[PDB]
Write a protein that binds this DNA or RNA. Sequence first.
DNA 1: TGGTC
Length: 177
Amino acid sequence: MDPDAIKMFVGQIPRSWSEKELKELFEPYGAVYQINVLRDRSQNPPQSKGCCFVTFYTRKAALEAQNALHNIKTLPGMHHPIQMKPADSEKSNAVEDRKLFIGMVSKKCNENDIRVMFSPFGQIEECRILRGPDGLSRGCAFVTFSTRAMAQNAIKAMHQSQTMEGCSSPIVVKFAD
DNA sequence: TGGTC
Ligand SMILES: [Mg+2]
């Protein structure tokens, strides 16, 4: 398979189908490397959970199949069309693993001051000062970078690097809970 | 109030 191939998750497959029927469904869109039905072994006999993974050899074939099938094609006996999307095992750079909690921020700071402070470390895609139900700043912020490496460099360079106005302790910079 | 969506 190509180094950029995508394993795809496919839902709304008839439980009666196996890899044999799925091979006939998918191969017209491109060469298929692997098909695996997700199975339930909780009792005897085991059964299909009604979904599968398909890995095309090429990324282009995976994307064309997804474009052609997802919410388009209804398989026999089904009441809803195929759902098709990249498999969760393909996720690599999750937002939660590149989001920082910034603590001990001056209650005066706004999202723009934080961006100015953390911009040197990479592309910021989200920045929020945290506010309670009264609307008052809670003295902390969330900063999401585009990659985890950016977030880690910000931690090493900024954690306890200074104490802001009105704060009892130096700024805290850590991966968010 | 050292406060994590
Ligand atoms: Mg408090």
